[PDB]
Design a protein around this ligand. Structure first.
Ligand SMILES: [Cu+2]
Ligand SMILES: [Cu+2]
Ligand SMILES: [Cu+2]
Ligand SMILES: [Cu+2]
Ligand SMILES: [Cu+2]
Ligand SMILES: [Cu+2]
Ligand SMILES: [Cu+2]
Ligand SMILES: [Cu+2]
Ligand SMILES: [Cu+2]
Ligand SMILES: [Cu+2]
Ligand SMILES: [Cu+2]
Ligand SMILES: [Cu+2]
Lengths: 467, 467
């Protein structure tokens, strides 16, 4: 007579979902085989006075139910004021913490703040290296990305990015083009430490919010140096090793870095109607520039296919599409050429934006969230990643963020986050016939989620290769 | 082929679950008809520096999906240090806030702190009056309970309780008996306000935790006046009106109050081996005493059946049972006589404790949580509330707290809370054949939960009549 929710979980397999909660100040692991929260952690318990829990990634574990480690970062200061919540803390903590947490099979344990260890505080995307020997973080207020060692939490390399606009007016600073500088960042304090915790290095006093990139042109984003912003977002990894790609939202480019030799090698041009690449110019052993005649569109989410054959960059607002490069030539990224653009006649307005992504293990399909401001339903576009065409779009609810996939490829698990004030949930979609199976409660404002990987192979479709 | 979790929710009906998160610092409403979190609120966003979100109760709403109001309180100070979390907060807030929150069909809105309005801060059970015209709060650190007006958030009446032990040694202070004073508590500040916000009035510097009543005897609970503690817990309401009952954990008694005439009328004696009642002695128009020769056992949870015919008090630790009075005589509580004791040969050790409860609408069954410290599975006892016998016990998981019931009587919805550091969930049990249907994720340390009532009749099986 009665339906058991246990029958629903039985089909999903033995997979652990982990997500941060943005304004909730919390992070939580969920057993998809039972519906239990396995453990949660509230950063306010550790004296965090602005625990905006932002991005996260989990290292592979041979058995996540026995133990797994993850990295979750924070934002602070005026980031607290930019969602609909009538917050009262006029002078919050500066955030940019990089927390190391271990689930030990019973509880979450706060290990340390890697920003205190390294001296480098960064507040946007967190990714695991394909070797699971380290992690990377980007930041779009200070325009810095870095790869960190997993054992020591020390910086392996850090890059700072700067914009020199052709026209010194916020309305024209990106549209009329300019020169981006790529600068090696070296430690300045004893013990190989940086002096870049909290708000140190901020060019703008809050993040460019989802869909909000062009507010900076209209003078709506306060800061020391907004004319010089590029809004770095992430450093994603080629699953084949060697390369990391830094995404720059405002100039609409991605920079390909040699991880081992610690140099940039290529600049990918995001907008449809631009060449495959812009020319990287070496100035000195620590300094490169790239000239961009005009920025046709901002961009945001970025990722590799799990076989490394495709590199994707999402153009936003001025164009809404997925730009696709042929990255098949692992030896030389300067050869990576545009091969496709995913477009839809249904992507008509400034919104929706092509947003977060996850590939199937075989790289034949990609799931991409479609983001709108309140109250238009957000949802998932199902994309044929062989012919680069939209198969299907499904309406789900408010403020959709990240997608993960069970490592058998069977279920996509996504987050909806209520713009930090309304309805939020986990969504489950089966990948065989792309039906939405329904929602699980999730009282959190997640801008990220992962399924805990078991193998290095699993990482190729987790928070390593894509945002 | 694939199971849709929407099929599970379809059977539950149009019911709204609400729960506070204790150490999570959050509160959340869940749509049981879809699995969505409807809205959540993080008290740190409103300058709360110790948001231990403790107890809560919701007022009836003709349509909870359009709007509902609820009350949720907080605990603070050294309460932060008594769970397994290795907390690091140098200057925790004092808590004892009484938040008024309104869900407006989109978001939760913080209305005000009733403790600031009234001047009276209380941190344990919150209950709605059976008229839905007010609410009550108890506190076991200050030993005060009060009924508040819904419109003004001002105190209607407040009672302070004090213990005078026969033996001035914490080991013997309750076992060897004493005299409890019941004192009318009057305001001291302009506008009829109390001076009892935050830690003001604390006799002990932290709560007696679930199953932890004994710690005070062993000198393990610091405070100004622990020898004078009674650990008031709740003020529950007779669904027929007129009477409110204050539960006292340490002396093992409940005090019946005349709400309108603002006087105590009866003292119910909890332990098996005590009479139905102890003698209430009037000292003056503001002061009553009751002599207790020996406290045989502490007690905790308390409640009326929905028809008001039965009153229940749970004896804990020294005895684990449910003491049941015949409360059928609404005109004169001094006539209420013991009529049953729910006992089990399995309840003969210190644990499990008979814990929180919910009745079926027809009062024929009661569901009672059975609490153990880690790692013994906690669960639900299903009780025949006509013959007062245990029908069934089911093992569920760690740290079980409250139960609510859908107002059609079909589904019991309970919370498990991981001792603030491990596994947590919502559990759903169908009441027809008492099968556990399974769990929903809940990344929260809930010591409470409600289903939003629609009618005054619904309140009879919500957070009004019982804890
Ligand atoms: Cu982000
Ligand atoms: Cu300038
Ligand atoms: Cu991003
Ligand atoms: Cu190669
Ligand atoms: Cu997102
Ligand atoms: Cu974000
Ligand atoms: Cu309680
Ligand atoms: Cu004394
Ligand atoms: Cu209680
Ligand atoms: Cu009567
Ligand atoms: Cu409880
Ligand atoms: Cu409690």
């Amino acid at each position: 007579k009665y339906v058991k929710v246990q029958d629903f979980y039985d089909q999903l397999g033995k997979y652990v979902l982990v997500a941060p909660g943005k304004f909730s100040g919390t992070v939580a692991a969920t057993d998809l085989s039972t519906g239990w929260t396995m453990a949660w952690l509230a950063a306010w318990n550790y004296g965090d006075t602005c625990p905006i829990m932002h991005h996260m990634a989990a290292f592979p574990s041979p058995d996540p139910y026995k133990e797994f480690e993850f990295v979750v970062n924070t934002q602070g200061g005026k980031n607290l004021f930019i969602y609909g919540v009538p917050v009262t803390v006029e002078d919050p903590g500066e955030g940019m913490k990089i927390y190391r947490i271990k689930y030990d099979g019973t509880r979450m344990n706060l290990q340390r703040d890697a920003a205190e260890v390294s001296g480098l505080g960064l507040g946007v995307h967190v990714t695991i290296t394909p070797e699971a020997d380290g992690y990377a973080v980007g930041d779009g207020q200070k325009d810095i990305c870095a790869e960190f060692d997993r054992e020591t939490d020390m910086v392996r390399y850090a890059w700072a990015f700067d914009w020199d606009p052709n026209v010194k007016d916020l309305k024209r600073a990106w549209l009329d083009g300019g020169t981006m500088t790529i600068k090696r960042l070296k430690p300045t304090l004893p013990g190989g430490r940086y002096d870049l915790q909290g708000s140190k290095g901020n060019k703008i006093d809050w993040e460019l919010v989802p869909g909000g990139e062009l507010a900076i042109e209209d003078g709506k984003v306060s800061g020391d140096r907004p004319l010089h912003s590029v809004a770095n977002d992430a450093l994603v990894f080629d699953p084949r090793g060697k390369w990391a790609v830094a995404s720059m939202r405002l100039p609409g480019v991605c920079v390909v870095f040699d991880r081992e030799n610690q140099v940039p090698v290529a600049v990918l041009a995001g907008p449809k109607g631009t060449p495959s690449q812009f020319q990287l110019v070496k100035v000195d052993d620590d300094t490169w520039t790239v000239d961009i005649p005009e920025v046709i569109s901002a961009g945001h989410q970025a990722g590799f296919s799990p076989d490394g054959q495709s590199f994707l960059f999402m153009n936003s607002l001025r164009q809404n599409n997925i730009m696709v490069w042929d990255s098949s030539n692992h030896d030389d990224p300067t050869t990576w050429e545009k091969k496709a653009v995913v477009e839809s006649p249904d992507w008509r307005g400034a919104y929706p934006n092509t947003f977060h992504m996850v590939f199937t293990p075989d790289a034949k399909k990609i799931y991409v969230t479609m983001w709108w401001p309140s109250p238009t339903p957000n949802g998932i576009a199902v994309i044929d990643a062989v012919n680069w065409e939209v198969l299907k779009e499904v309406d789900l609810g408010p403020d959709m963020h990240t997608l993960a996939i069970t490592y058998d490829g069977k279920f996509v698990v996504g987050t909806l986050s209520g713009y930090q004030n309304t309805a939020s949930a986990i969504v489950v979609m089966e990948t065989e016939t792309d039906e939405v199976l329904g929602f699980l409660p999730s009282p959190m404002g997640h801008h990220d989620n992962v399924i805990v990987p078991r193998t290095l192979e699993d990482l190729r479709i987790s928070r390593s290769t894509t945002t």
